[PDB]
Amino acid sequence: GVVAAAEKTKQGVLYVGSKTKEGVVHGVATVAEKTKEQVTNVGGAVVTGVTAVAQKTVEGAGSIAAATGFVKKDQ
Amino acid sequence: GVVAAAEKTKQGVLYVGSKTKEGVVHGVATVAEKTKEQVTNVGGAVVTGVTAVAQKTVEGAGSIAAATGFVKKDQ
Amino acid sequence: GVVAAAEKTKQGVLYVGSKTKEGVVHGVATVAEKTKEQVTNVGGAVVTGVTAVAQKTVEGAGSIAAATGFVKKDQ
Amino acid sequence: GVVAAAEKTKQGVLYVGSKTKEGVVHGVATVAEKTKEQVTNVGGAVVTGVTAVAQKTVEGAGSIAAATGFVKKDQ
Amino acid sequence: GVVAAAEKTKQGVLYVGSKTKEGVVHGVATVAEKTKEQVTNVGGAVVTGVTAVAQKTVEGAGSIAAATGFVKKDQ
Amino acid sequence: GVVAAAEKTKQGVLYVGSKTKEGVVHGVATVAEKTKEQVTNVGGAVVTGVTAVAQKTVEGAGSIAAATGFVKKDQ
C-alpha cells in the first residue's frame, strides 16, 4: 500500500513626477523568414527598417525616423 | 491500495504627475514570411517600415516618421 | 509499503523625478532566417536596419534614425 | 552645381516522396506579459503550455499532448 | 561642382524520399515578461512549458508531452 | 571640383533518403525577464521548462517530455 499526503495550514510624500514610464518600448517578438529588400537612391534619403526604438527629449526637437531629401540655400 | 490526499486549511501624498505611462508601446508580435520590397528614389525622401516606436518630447517638435522631399530657399 | 508526507505550518520624502523609466527598450526577441538586402546609393543617404535603440537627450536635438540626402549653401 | 546620375543597361526523375514538408511548425512569435498560472494535482495528470511542437511517427502511435489520469488493472 | 555617377552594363534520378523536411520546428521568437507559475503535485504527473520541440520516430511510439498519473497492476 | 565614379561591366543518382532534415529545431530566440516558478512534488513526477529539443529514434519508443507519477506491480 502506497500513501501520499500533503497539508498546508496557513493562519495569519509628494510624487511630483516620481514613477513614470515615458518613452518606453518593452515586449516585442518579431520574425522575418524570407524578406528580400532592394533600395536604389539617387540624390535623396531613404529610411527603412526602424523597429523597437524609444527616446525622450527635453527642450529639443526629436525625430525617430525622419528623412529630408535635399536642402539648398543659395545666394 | 493507493491513497492520495491533500488539504489546505487557510484562516485569516499629492501625486501630481506621479504614475503615468505616456509614450509607450508594450506588447507586439509580428511575423513576415515572404515580403518583397523595392524602392527607387530620385531626389526625394522615402520612409518605410517603422514599427514598435515610442518617444516623448517636452517643449519641442517631435515627429516619428516624417519625410520632406526637398527644401529650397534661394536669393 | 511506501509513505510520502509533507507539511508546511505557516503562521504569522519628495520624489520629484525619482523613479522614472524614460527612453528605455527592454525585452526584444528577433529572428531573421533568410533576408537578402541590396542597397545602391549615389549622392544621398540610406539608413536601414535600426533596432533596439534608446536614448535620452536634455537640452538638445536628438534623432534616432535620420537621413539628409544633401546640404548645399553657396555664395 | 551638383550632379547625381545612375544608369543600368540590362540586356539578355520520379520524385516519389521527394520534397515534402510534413510535420513542421515554422514561424511563430509569442508574447506573454503577466500570466499567472496555478495547478493543484492530486492523483491524476495535468498538461499545460505546449507550443511550437512538431513530430512525425512511422508505424507507431504518436500523441503530442496526451494525459491519462490513471490506469488500474487488478486480478 | 560635385559629380557622382554610377553605371552597370549587364549583358548575358529517382528522389524516393530524398529532400524532405519532416518533424522540424524552425523560426520561433518568444518573450515572457512576468510569468508566475506554481505547481503542487501529490501522487500524479504534471507537464508544463514544452516549447520548440521536434522529433521523428521510426517503428516506435513517440509522445512529445505525455503524462500518466499512475499505473497499478496487482495480483 | 570633386568627382566620384563607379562602373561595373558584367558580360557572360538515386537519392533514396539522401538530403532530409528530420527531427530538427533551428532558429529560436527566447527572453524571460522576471519569471518566478515554484514546484512542490510529493510522490509523483513534474516536468517543466523543456525548450529547443530535438531527437530521432529508429526502432524504439521515444518521448521528449513524459512524466509517469508512479508504477506499482505487486504479487
Curated annotation (Swiss-Prot), chains A, B, C, D, E, F:
> What GO terms in the biological process aspect are recorded for it?
adult locomotory behavior; amyloid fibril formation; behavioral response to cocaine; cellular response to copper ion; cellular response to epinephrine stimulus; cellular response to fibroblast growth factor stimulus; cellular response to oxidative stress; chemical synaptic transmission
Its main subcellular localisation, reduced to a broad class, is cytoplasm
- Record key words, sorted: Acetylation, Alzheimer disease, Amyloid, Cell projection, Copper, Cytoplasm, Disease variant, Membrane, Metal-binding, Neurodegeneration, Nucleus, Parkinson disease, Parkinsonism, Phosphoprotein, Repeat, Secreted, Synapse, Ubl conjugation
Q: Give the modified residues of type Phosphoserine.
A: 63
- Spell out the GO cellular component terms annotated for this protein, sorted alphabetically and separated by semicolons: actin cytoskeleton; axon; axon terminus; cell cortex; cytoplasm; cytosol; extracellular region; extracellular space
Q: How is it modified after translation?
A: Phosphorylated, predominantly on serine residues. Phosphorylation by CK1 appears to occur on residues distinct from the residue phosphorylated by other kinases. Hallmark lesions of neurodegenerative synucleinopathies contain alpha-synuclein that is modified by nitration of tyrosine residues and possibly by dityrosine cross-linking to generated stable oligomers.
Tissue expression remark: Highly expressed in presynaptic terminals in the central nervous system. Expressed principally in brain.
Each sequence repeat, start to end: 18-32, 33-43
Q: What is the effect of changing residue 26 to Q?
A: In PARK1; no effect on protein structure; no effect on phosphorylation of the protein; no effect on membrane- and lipid-binding; increases oligomerization; increases fibril formation; increases secretion of the protein; impairs copper-binding
Q: Which family does it belong to?
A: Belongs to the synuclein family.
Please state what the annotation says regarding this protein's domains.
The 'non A-beta component of Alzheimer disease amyloid plaque' domain (NAC domain) is involved in fibrils formation. The middle hydrophobic region forms the core of the filaments. The C-terminus may regulate aggregation and determine the diameter of the filaments.
Q: What name is this protein filed under?
A: Alpha-synuclein
Classification of source organism: Eukaryota, Metazoa, Chordata, Craniata, Vertebrata
Q: Which part of the complete protein is shown?
A: 14 to 99 of 140
